[PDB]
Structure formats: C-alpha cells, structure tokens
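Q: What does the assembled structure look like for these inputs?
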Amino acid sequence: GHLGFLPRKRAASIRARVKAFPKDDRSKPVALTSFLGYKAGMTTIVRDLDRPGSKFHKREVVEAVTVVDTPPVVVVGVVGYVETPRGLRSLTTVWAEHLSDEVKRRFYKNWYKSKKKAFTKYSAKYAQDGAGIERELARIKKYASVVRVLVHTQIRKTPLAQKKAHLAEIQLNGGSISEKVDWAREHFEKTVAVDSVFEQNEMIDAIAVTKGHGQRGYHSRTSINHKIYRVGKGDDEANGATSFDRTKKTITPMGGFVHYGEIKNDFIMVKGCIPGNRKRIVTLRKSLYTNTSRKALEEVSLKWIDTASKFGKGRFQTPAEKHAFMGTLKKDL
Amino acid sequence: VEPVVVIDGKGHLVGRLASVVAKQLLNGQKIVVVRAEELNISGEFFRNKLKYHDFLRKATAFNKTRGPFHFRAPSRIFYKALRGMVSHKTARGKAALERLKVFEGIPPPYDKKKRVVVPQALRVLRLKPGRKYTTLGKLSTSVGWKYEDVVAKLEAKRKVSSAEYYAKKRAFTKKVASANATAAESDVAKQLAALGY
RNA sequence: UUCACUGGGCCAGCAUCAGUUUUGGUGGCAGGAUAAAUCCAUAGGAAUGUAGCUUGCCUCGGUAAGUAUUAUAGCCUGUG
RNA sequence: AUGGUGAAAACCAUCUAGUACUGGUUCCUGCCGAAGUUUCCCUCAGGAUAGCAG
RNA sequence: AGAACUGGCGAUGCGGGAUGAACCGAACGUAGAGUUAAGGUGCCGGAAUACACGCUCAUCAGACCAAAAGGUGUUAGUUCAUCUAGACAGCCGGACGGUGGCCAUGGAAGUCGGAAUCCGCUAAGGAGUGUGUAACAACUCACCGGCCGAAUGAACUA
RNA sequence: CGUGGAGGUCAGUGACGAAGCCUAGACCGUAAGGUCGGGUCGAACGGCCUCUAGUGCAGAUCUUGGUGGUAGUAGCAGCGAAACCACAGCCAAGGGACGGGCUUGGCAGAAUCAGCG
RNA sequence: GCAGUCGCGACAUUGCUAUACCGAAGCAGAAUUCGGUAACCCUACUGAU
RNA sequence: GGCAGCCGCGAAGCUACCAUCCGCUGGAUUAUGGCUGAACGCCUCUAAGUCAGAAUCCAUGCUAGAACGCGGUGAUUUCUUUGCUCCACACAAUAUAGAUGGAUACGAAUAAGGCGUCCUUGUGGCGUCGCUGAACCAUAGCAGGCUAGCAACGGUGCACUUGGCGGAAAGGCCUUGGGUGCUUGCUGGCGAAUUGCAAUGUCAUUUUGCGUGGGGAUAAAUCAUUUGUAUACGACUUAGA
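A:
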C-alpha cells in the first residue's frame, strides 16, 4: 500500500482524535469546529441530480450513505493553549464542575469498585462565591488567543452497551477570544444539538478507526469531501421523510440496524461510507479549507430513503406494508 | 570568572561561537546561548542551503530511519555543530555537554540577566565589509522551522517594556549621576581624585 | 620499677650549599662610513611653491591661475 | 607377503612402530648474531663450494 | 619486460601522517629533570583565533592525470602606438561630382552576382560594412568637421 | 629456577601436626620460583656439596575422565536429547591488496513472543 | 585509418575507403523538430509485550 | 429420514473491476522573460537590488507519536497498626563534572553609535563619550565579639504588611506603613595569645530515615467472572455495593 499510511501498527485508541483544526478568523462569530457521533449502520438513498452539465442532469440517482447517531453533546470544560518556540502548551483548564457519572466512569477503569470520590474537593471552588473561576477566565483572556472546549456525549441516550462517555476537544472560530470565553461562560454545563453548527449540503470531512480484519486493519483513517444530506432530530417528526415521499417514518429500518440498536434520536446522514464499523465513534470536521467547487456548492433534494430490513434481504419498506400485503395470518388470527 | 555566562548569538559566527563554547565547556565554564535564531553563517544563502542538503541526503544508505536526524531548529543546529567539536561518547564529553543550554530568543529568567558577547566571533569583526552572509533563522525556516513567526512576535513583545525598563534605569542613573556631581568638589572627593578614585 | 630524654618509623617547612636546567633586571667593553641617524653652521636646487606682488573672480575683499627660492612656512643636495 | 575364518561388498594375528609431505616440538635471564648468495660440477633432482656470523 | 648498484623490509620497536608494510625523523636497559627531530599550535588535540606583505566566492573551491585552450571573472607585468598641434568614449554635422562605370537582365544604380576596383576634389569619403525598399528612397561604419575632458586602445606574459 | 631417585652432611623438620590443597593476606628476586600470616588435612618431609633422568605444556582436527551454552529445546501434566561452539553481532567511509574486534562519523534503550521473507 | 595542403605544428582543409514548463525553425492553425529544467543463518523485515 | 449425502433457496462470514464513497492548497525557487544600473562617460535581467514563475524544495493536511521529549486537570489509602501529605525544630547518612562576594538585564547598525542640553519636536542644533570589563555596589568588626556617645533618619538583614507587573521554561521584581538588629558616617571602654612557624584546618547544597510540634486529606490500580467494537499467544474494550 501507499507508504503514507505505514507503518501498519494498531491504532493508539478506538476513539480517534482530530489532528488539525480549521483556520480561524478574528472577526467571525463563535462557531464550533467539529462534532462527534457513533456510526449506526448505513442505508441507501435516492435523490434528484440537478447538477448542470452532467450526463444525467435533472435525472434521479441512487447511492449509499452512512447514518451517524449524534445525540446532544454536553460541555464540561474549556482549555487554553499557549504558543511557544516548542509548540502549543496547555496553559489552563477550567471545568464546569457538573461532571456526570458517565465521565466519572470514564476516569475510573473499575468504577464498580471505585469509591467515586472524583471531583469532590474541586467542586468547592464552584459551589460558593468563588471568583477563582473568574480569575482563571481573566488569565485566559489576557493570555493565549486559541481556546478549546471539552465536551462529552450522552452515551446513556445512545442505545449502546458501552455506557461510558468519551471526552472530545472542539475549537471555536469566534474572534476576540474575550468573546469566546464569555460565550463559554454562558454555555457552561449546557448541551449543544446537531443543527446548531452544521447545515444541509455542507461539505465536511470525517475521521474514524477502520474495522480490523486480522495485524490487518484497525487504524485511524480520515475521509474528506463528504456532503451532509440530512440532520434529523428526535423532536423532529418523521426524520426519514422527504418532500416527495413524505412518509411519516424514521430512518430506522424494519427490525432496526444489524448489530446496532433502533436509532430514534438525533442523527446525521452524509454522502459516502465514512470509515469505521457499527457502534464505532467518529468525528466530523467542518472543511478546514473553504472549497468553492461546484461539487461542494451544489445542494441535494432527498427523494426517498431506504428503510427495508437489512438482515437477510428486505421484503418490504415499513411494517404497515408487510401486514397489508399479507392480509391475514394464523399468527394474527 | 562567572558561574554562568549568557552569550547572545545575534551577529556571531556559528563556527567560532561553537568552538569557543566547546573550549569553555571543556574548561568547566557553564554557558547558555540565547538568540540562536539570529545567528549568522558566512557564505551565501544558496551555498548554505546546498551544503545543508548535500549533508541531509548523506544521512545513511543502509537505513534512513536509523541514520542521523535532521534537526531544523537553529538551536539544535548550533548544538550539533558544537558537538562536532567535542569528544562525544566519553564521560568527560557527556558531562561537559550538560553545562550548555541553547534556546531561541531570550527565554526567562535569562532575559532578566546580563548577556555577554564574544568579540572574536562577531560577524561585524570577522567578515569583510560587503560580503554575503546567511541567517540561521532564515536557513531554519527554509528547512522547516515552523516557529519563526512566534519567535519574532515574542521577542518584539519582550522589547516592549524592555524599552520601559531601560528608560527607568536611565532615569535612575541620571539622577544618581546628578547627585554625585552636586556632591563633588568636597574634601573627600578631592582626596579620592588624588588617589585615582 | 614512675614518668621524661634520646636513637628509631610516615609527611613537609625554613637557611645556605654541589650537579643539570628555565626565565628576568642591570653594568663595562672592541667593530660599522672610528655605524649611519638626529642636531648646529654655510652655497645652491626644486615644487605636491610658504611669505609678498599681478589678472578673472562668487563668500563681505572672497577664491583660480601666473610671479615670487624664504619673505609672516618648511624640504633636498654638497661641505665643515 | 605368511597362516586361518565365513560366504548369493571380505575379515582376523605377525613382517609392521614397513616407503616424505601436513600437524606438533614444554622453564627463566644475559651476550653475540647474520644470511638469503659467488663458484664449476650445467641445471632440471641433490649435495659440494664461497661469503657472513664463532 | 631485461642487466645492474645503492638504502627500508626482512630480522624492526618509537614520534607525525584520519588510517596504509614502500612516506620524514629516529633505531630501543629501568627512572627523574631539561632541550629537540619530523609534524603541528580553533575544537576533538598538548601548542599563538601570532605578527607582516596579496591573491579567491569556488553553485559540493582549498587544505590531494586527458587540458592544449575559453570566461564582458579578478589582479600584476612586457611590445606597439595616439596625447594639451586635444588619449578612448559620449553628443551633433559632412559623409561628394563623373556614376545609374561594364556585364549576366523587365531591376542588382553600393549591398541576389562577375571582372575591376577607374579618375577629379579635398577635411574625407570604400563603384560602399550593414539595415531595407521590386530598383530608386531613407538610416548607416570608417573617414573626416564642432562641445566635454588626459591618459587610452591594441598584441602578449603571468 | 623446578621435579623423581641416589651418594655425604644439617648429631635436620615433624602427633604441641610433614606432605597436598585453599588462602580479594605479607615479603624476597628482572625471572623461572622461594619464604611467611590464617582454614581442612593426617605420618612423612626439606636446605646444603655432588651423580642420574621415562624431568617442566597453550594447542598436535592429540590421548584418558569430567563439566558448560545449545536446552528444560527437538522429541515421547510429566520424562527428556543430539549437531555445533577461539569470541560476539548496527551501519557509511579509508584500509592505496583482507576488514568482524584499525581509523573517522551517525548512533545505540534492558529483556522478550510471533508470520517468514 | 593513410596521405597533403598550413625545426617542432592548434581548429579548419582535399584525396580513397513519458509528461509539464521555456527560446527558436518560413512557428498562418494543428502537428512536427532542435537546445535546457531530468523522469537452528549475522544486519534483517514487520506485528506486539 | 432418529446414522451419511443430493436437490432449490439461503442469510452471516469468506470476500470483489463483479460493486460502493473519497483522494489536498500556500510560499521559497532554478531555468526563463523584464526593471532599475556602472564597471567600459553609450549599452546590459546582475555585479549592488529587484518583479513572475518548473513533474524542484519547504510548508497545510494525512499516519505513527521519543514507551528514555513536554503542560494542565479529578482521585491521592481514617488504617501500609494516626497510617499518609505540607511546613518549623534536632541527629545521621548521602554525595557533589566541583561557590569560596555579586550570572551587574533596552533595541538596531557597524562606511556608525550612544549620554546631557535646547526648541524648530526632527533623518533638527550644540557639547561630550569609546579607543574594551584594568569596568560599577561592596569590600575595617573573634569567619567579624561585649559595650558609650556625636551627626543624620538615610543604608541594610528579619518576618510582616497595600497593590501591580512577569505564561517562553511565568515560580521573580518593584514597592506602600510600622516594628525589630547592625549601621565602619564620626569619636571611645575591654576579650583575642597555647593551633606554639602552616597543614581546605572545616561555616555551601541534593536527597533520604529514625523523632517532636503546627496545618490537611483519608482513595485508587491489577487479578477473577463478565463482556466485544480483537485476536497468533500477550494485548486491546465493556459491566456488576
């Protein structure tokens, strides 16, 4: 294979980490640089092709897409990074103090025996008049103008057996880092939804860890230039509907995804097959460089979403279809 | 003469500075080099780049990974040049190498202490007027020194309020000199003048 | 048989000594063209021409070019 | 070679410690100490002979 | 490749040469003090980053034989010349009449070509060194005339 | 210098301990070796003037016997080898002929299992 | 190669025997050509404690 | 077909030009074409400078991440018999790539620079400095003692005390107010000896442990099972007061 992807050693951790962040402007408002999710299988999509000058312009096309469950992500702290002649150094980290049992379990390898004393004395600095947090924030304001916010996922909401949350650093693109830290102050302990950052048809890149094949595979990999197709939310009725079919059904196929739970919460649908297997954690960065190609600028209008069963070979699309076709059965009567 | 000697690399010659620092290390004098990125090397920039590349491609034919490592930082380049003038692999050489520290710019607390220079290793004194010369910082940034901007930025930041510190010191020295001058002409001052003080 | 003194063992200093040897200070001698220089005196010579004189001339009487071998500078040669 | 053994590639005891070219050649100290070649028997075989060193 | 003589090796330690039996010195009892050979005095490396006169930017110089020659690289010498009757160069002006010489010929008039290279005037002009027009036309370098100022150009050695 | 035996001597040493051996103990000498300090040992041993030799080991793909890594491996939880072994395993350069321990450089991170490339 | 024209005789001299980027060629366009940037084993190998 | 298979289908693995999604942008450049330009009173892309630009180089991105490079953060053992952590007090060991006053702080250039003064506030006018640091504080008291006054009320050590500055390796500084030693700035009252003519003649710091006192916290990791998103053994990844 290509020497750039060597050596073939196993990935450092299953949770891949972003190694680069989008360029920041000192005038634009605050905006998150990346998000995280869990690959909850894949599906098939059919959509119109309005691309001009194409051999199949105005026609319909079919493709495969990957669904990633992206529940609300809750902030837990903010970190400042100072530039030096020896790279970036973590000058200061200040936490929300509202650390959940999930992050406590993440910090404790054998939680079932741990006394669960993590973050007890430090809570005093926040559960009073304090002003130590204010002093640290002023220190950050005066000092380095690059800030990263620590967040974790609501793993309990996600239908997974891991039950352990994961920490992730996200950069902010807002100028006047005083404003960045002020926004962090008001958003401390808060949860951000998917639709806040990304938008439909936006071009992004994804990073994950590939499935192991026996060493074979099991390495961190990044796939760039992926177009976001949909951003569905649990509170959004009929997340799997479209303008044409407008069927009041969820993206969850008949019997749910194979080797994964029946997703009924926030999720993102993007072009291509993002690396990583089912239940694998992946991260999504927002196009470090503002590509102006027609491929990125074009929009997509979803026509219909495949929802037939994946285990085996799908016989119908929705449960209402099978029983309607059958009419009656001994299993029923 | 001094427990630690701070040497400013700006305007100096790499070879002469390395030789003198190695000699001082072998003699037991602790030396710390500052402003390495501002060091200069005789010869044209193109010639310096060619002579760096011909050595970089000479790393090793048998195993590139096990061959030498091309340190791009000017401080590491100066350290390698000095090590080339020291009997490394020996206990005495290893002990001497611990007495040398090289940092880009003037990191603290060295910034608050006096910095000396070596007259016999200055470009202004060793190079003929009008002759081309190469900048160590430019050479490093050409070969992959990605910290040049930050170095200049924080050096300028230091010089900001270094000017203020100098202004305060100058005012204090002027006041002291005026106080001494108005105290002159006294019997003690005249007696000291006779003895040379 | 009490303790002390002495000869006796390990390391050096002080003063002067004999051999080898390194590096300073200072004095008296014979030779050079009886060193040459430098200095004093005398006749000339010259300009990279000092005083003074003449013709343009801007900066008020300011400067260039001619003259002038010493005058309100000095130099060289020959000689004692 | 002599004397015996068994048998559908021989063996056993003596002459035989039988015929040069490899290999090996054991304590210390002091003094001296070279040579690598002349001569014809022509030489290919081998000594003789002369010099150095006692 | 062959005759032949001298010195090391042989049978040979030591100093320097990154390292090399054949390179230079030096040939050997165990020790101390002092002075040296060859080689060195920026570091590894013990010794001056000594003094004095000049050369070189080499784009892998320099510390180590095919190459005579070229370089609008640099720095010194020899021979010719012209010079305050004006050194080279720079700017402006003349740069002729016969003549459009004869011929190959629709045209080669100075410039597609051949033989000639003719004479007059001068201060000097080639039957023309080139640009170029179908030929003429126009510019022109070399030859001369006016302003600026002084050493310059050529041929060789190194 | 050292050893086996032998001739004369020390009217020699020696159960109150002679040989041999051990001895990170001290002396003698340039040296073969000799002497003494301490532990086991148990019945013989040394200096001096001379004669004698089956008289002194670092190798001989040496002989007799024994012991190491290979190896707790192959093999048939247990039993359990053989071949091989001056001595070990990072490279570039020069060695004007051979570089694996010479020289100049880069560097080397204990120990350890697996697929053969 | 030999010979000859130019005391040793320097060049001339006659006899026989891939793509991409540049300047050009009489490059109208396309295409083409020339000159440049030049394309049961040591060390092991790799996964891993 | 209760024993060993065929027929047709057949997920899930095995696993693909037999399919599926994607596959970077910014500089320094050489070649090359020009600008300003004397050497060579004219020219000239080059010698001083200088514009653009190559499948060239470096950067952005991607993969690994020195297990011997680094920063921040939660928990940090109520029983490892008051155990453990931070300080003050007293004894030892431990050694020191090697104090024997002070590592005494503008920047840029070197065919140029500072310091003082002035107004014309600048590339301004005037004076002066260097020509090395041979430099500046401090340098007297038993290795620095016990005491009395004079003139100043300054200098310095002590814990303190109000604030700011310093994030590059900040871990240090300036001060604001009082108290408490010395003050050799100046003049006095006493011990010094015997170490015998010298033996570094001993005073510094890196850490650790046994003890006393004064503050503080009082939890984790590995194994077993389980688990899978991993498999070649290890490893990796989950759960149960």
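The helical segments of chain A are 101-107, 122-126, 132-142, 177-187, 294-297, 319-326.
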